[PDB]
Amino acid sequence: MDTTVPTFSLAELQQGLHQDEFRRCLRDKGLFYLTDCGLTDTELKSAKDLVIDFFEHGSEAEKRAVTSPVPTMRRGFTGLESYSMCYSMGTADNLFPSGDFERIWTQYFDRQYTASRAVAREVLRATGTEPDGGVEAFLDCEPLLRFRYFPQVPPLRMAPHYDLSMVTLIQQTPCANGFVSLQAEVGGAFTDLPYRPDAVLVFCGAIATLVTGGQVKAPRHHVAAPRRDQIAGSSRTSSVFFLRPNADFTFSVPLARECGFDVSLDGETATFQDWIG
Ligand SMILES: [Fe+3]
């Protein structure tokens, strides 16, 4: 029935406003747009410009030195070869082309990490939730940022997934031609998730569901390639920041499958580590 995605100001939520609507939204949709949270369009454009500058003008030997060694370990570039190029970062072990790149992207990652902790902190407070060990130890974690860029201009459809994250924050730049790759299931339909001025998009992931004892939905979503007719003017970017728990974070396996999550393992409990390793 209900297929819209709400918008909230983070400062207002922190200010105690809109408590009932926020709780409903988490339980029933697990996704929303967010303003006033310490992220800006301008910070995104600059980070984006630098990486595109490198894509276009970095030499062959420079490009190889920052290309990721093994895709398992998720750092450096992919697809620079001179669909899409990709740049990934974590809290350490990062690969940078230059000093200014390192500074701008370190700052961008820090702000994004900070915005994500603040959002997660709000999700836990609205569901009256205290993870074991405390909120702060839990949010001081092992996050990952992935920035994708689709150049071509100025195919297999994959199945919707949920994210293996406490929270995921998504910023994007729009397509000239109006095309929207990001879609989620809300109330039984597939809804578009476009660029919205001065808003970051937020998804709750499975970890949010687990940590709140089922009070938050993790929405299924997929990103779609353009069809042949909608290729002209389909260049775009996204920045995706996964707030992932520490490897030693633990959960009840009754609970996990009871929520509908493919779990290989068995027993009373497990870690996040073995749930992907
Ligand atoms: Fe995803």
From Swiss-Prot:
One of its GO terms (molecular function) is L-ascorbic acid binding. Its EC number is 1.14.20.1. Keywords: Antibiotic biosynthesis, Iron, Oxidoreductase, Vitamin C. It comes from the Bacteria. Its cofactor is Fe cation; L-ascorbate. Gene3D superfamilies: B-lactam Antibiotic, Isopenicillin N Synthase, Chain. Pathway: Antibiotic biosynthesis; cephalosporin C biosynthesis. Residues 140-245 form the Fe2OG dioxygenase domain. It catalyses: penicillin N + 2-oxoglutarate + O2 = deacetoxycephalosporin C + succinate + CO2 + H2O. GO terms for biological process: antibiotic biosynthetic process. Belongs to the iron/ascorbate-dependent oxidoreductase family. Catalyzes the step from penicillin N to deacetoxy-cephalosporin C. This is Deacetoxycephalosporin C synthase. It comes from Streptomyces clavuligerus.
